[PDB]
Design a protein around this nucleic acid. Sequence first.
DNA 1: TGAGACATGCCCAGACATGCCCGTTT
DNA 2: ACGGGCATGTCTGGGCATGTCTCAAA
Lengths: 231, 231, 231, 231
Amino acid sequence: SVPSQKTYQGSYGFRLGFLHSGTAKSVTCTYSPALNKMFVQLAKTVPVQLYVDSTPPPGTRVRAMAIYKQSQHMTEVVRRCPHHERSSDSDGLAPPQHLIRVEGNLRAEYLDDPNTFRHSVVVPYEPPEVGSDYTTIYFKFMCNSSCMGGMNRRPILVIITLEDSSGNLLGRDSFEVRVCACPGRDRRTEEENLRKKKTMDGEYFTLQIRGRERFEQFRERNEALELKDAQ
Amino acid sequence: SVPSQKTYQGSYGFRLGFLHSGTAKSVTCTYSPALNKMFVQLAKTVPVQLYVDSTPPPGTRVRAMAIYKQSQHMTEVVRRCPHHERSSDSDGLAPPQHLIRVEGNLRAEYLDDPNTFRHSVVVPYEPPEVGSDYTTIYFKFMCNSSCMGGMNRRPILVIITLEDSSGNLLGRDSFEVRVCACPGRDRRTEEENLRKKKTMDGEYFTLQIRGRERFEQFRERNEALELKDAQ
Amino acid sequence: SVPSQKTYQGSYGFRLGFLHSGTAKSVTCTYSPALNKMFVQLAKTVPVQLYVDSTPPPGTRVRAMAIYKQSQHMTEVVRRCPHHERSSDSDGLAPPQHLIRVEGNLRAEYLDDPNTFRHSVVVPYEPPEVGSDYTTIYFKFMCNSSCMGGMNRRPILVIITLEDSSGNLLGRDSFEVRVCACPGRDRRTEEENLRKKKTMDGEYFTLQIRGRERFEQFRERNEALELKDAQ
Amino acid sequence: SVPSQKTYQGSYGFRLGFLHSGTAKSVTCTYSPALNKMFVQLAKTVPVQLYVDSTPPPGTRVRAMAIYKQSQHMTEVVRRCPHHERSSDSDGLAPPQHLIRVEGNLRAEYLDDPNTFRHSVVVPYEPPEVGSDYTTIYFKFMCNSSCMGGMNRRPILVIITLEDSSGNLLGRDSFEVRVCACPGRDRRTEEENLRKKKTMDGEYFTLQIRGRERFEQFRERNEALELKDAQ
DNA sequence: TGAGACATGCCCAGACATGCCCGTTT
DNA sequence: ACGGGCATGTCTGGGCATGTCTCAAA
Ligand SMILES: [Zn+2]
Ligand SMILES: [Zn+2]
Ligand SMILES: [Zn+2]
Ligand SMILES: [Zn+2]
């Protein structure tokens, strides 16, 4: 079974938010909106902001899980490479197989589901600190997005979800994460192969569309991309 | 007896949906909008969606059984060549003789009717989560649609039924499959054969777009339209 | 264990000889000396000549065995593809797994060694028929040099050997065989990629060789290829 | 404890020999007379010849062991990386953790010396088949020479040794290994960086040659000799 | 540390490979 | 009865991907 990744703000307008990269511990963790992807170094900290309109009811929790992005791999549980699964790199509260880890919260709980066989981590929801309108959370990924025996270069996706005391869904969101050794580089590169997927390709193509009422449906459809593009 | 490929939605809405993606020569899957055919590689994952209207009673199961579309052999069991049939992989819960399997679903069941010796698989039916509005089971075909001493190029058609808790009918639909090597290829090419095979008649509407795949999906997203005027 | 393929005429000057192709059942079996390779169709007859100086002692036998040509494959026994291993295409005297078969000799014996696990066939040595100075023998190969589960396109090598009553070696020889569906074609093609491996490549390269006495060793060495080439 | 590598021909003039393969990135194994190094891909065949002036006593054995080359790690037992170790390969006759395996020899024995803890495999010595004047033996290296949590990019040295019935040293020789994914390329480079690092001292005669493949062949014959006057 | 410059495992668009199915000549 | 397109599985050199080492400048 492959858990959903469908965005769903729920009745609390739950959604995620990230920070920029170019100061202190930034090159060791950068986010590119154009890709909605987080580039980060093995075992280094990645901060994430939880935004919510109203306020979650008592007992509310926040969970984080990973699924592969590509379809031929989804059904495959995202484990940790074997080499690393055998290392003292564990605060103690978190099992060695788990890829994702919450940093700085002894209230965090790790789960290795009996049925789905999926790996996840949960923490009690906490209200924003007076001043800011979000609750930042810290994550750490324990294997490179290219370890053999592990993810094996298969792009992964992190699904953050807001569940109630009973576990029921209340809101969901997600983002792509690539663990590596040169976040800055890999980000540029990828932001480049994109800034080269629009210019490099410019040729035009036509299409025959029968139906007076149908043409206006494709017209107003394509007349829409003509705006959100040249800008 | 012989299984019917009658497009029987049922009284709930047991239909089919497939992911819209490119058709370059490097992908493992790619659907035939037109021919309702599939082009997944050997042993790769096949994402099959299942929309509906009303939730069937607590027990409805889904099943998969293959059939050769060609009238000549449309009465012969769809097995595996003794080669791969003599091969066991990471799956100690799914017989080597069966063609179709489901990925991640320990609730699955593979059986050969003691009357038809038919290869079929039945996996429990789960309803859509909160937010989303459908469900997709992950199928995996274990043999090329051209392996000598088996299917042997004989085109096929997967019959996905929605039989209730007592094996009785309650929904059904099907689609063609082509376990080939370059899914993009035998999709770019097995498609043009229906893009020069006839000239036809009619007066469309002129509408040109932009983009390579951006459009390759656009003109592609032009087939699912006029199909509501014949059968 | 990979049996030897080292040519060895022995004390009887044992060696092999073939015929030309371009008459009757020729296109269904051709030999190209430039390659010392026999191109032949599945299940069709291939004739081979056994030449020997003196005359083998009483009890002498002749064996034929196949080994893969490429090194990463030698250690692999040359079996028959699974599809074919299950067919009535057997005179009865010869097991279905065996690739090589002697045609027209009920005195022939097939072996499936207990240790080497190799497949072989043997026949009592017979003197030339008055007139010719050789003993022709007939072979048949029961799988295409490209059957999956079988040789799988891996080039094979046939080692004919002259053993005594006890089994001791007395002479050995060998030749390359490719089973296919278009011997003529495949032969030309290959005789072409060769007639294109000498002309296509002509550039010269130099080499520094210290040692007065050593230079004359490479001189008389290369001064040798200058003769057997332009001719 | 660290085993000796000091060559030792012994009273039977024991020493190894290798084939003469090329460098196309399609080769799976390829030795270097220059570097006296083998470049084989993961789990592929590496034939090693065994020459001996006189035949050994009844019971003589050949044992092959690996050692890290570098003085720093020369005391660290060579094991398979965590990943490949957790893979039971179609060779249940051999320990899942042994780096070196032998192919096609049921009489082979794998070892885990209690004291030293080193790993090695042994096989009974076999006299050269008539006509031939040496014995080859087939090995496989179950792990790239850079698996992490394994050799981890550390060069190793395989020490073939000839021991007797009562395991006494009889002779010994060795060679360098590297398990890649491009034995062709990797060797070209490594061989090239030597074919530049040295200038040597002397008077060199000049010999022009025709043909890249042929030239490369002499060049090899010549670099091998240029080693027969170094160490 | 920040940017090259390697090192070394792997993708791949574009050929090649190889069994066949026509159709038509010596 | 041997040259010709054809349906399909597959090889391959040129390039790309991804961790890590190395030297000079805030
Ligand atoms: Zn790892
Ligand atoms: Zn098959
Ligand atoms: Zn076969
Ligand atoms: Zn390994």
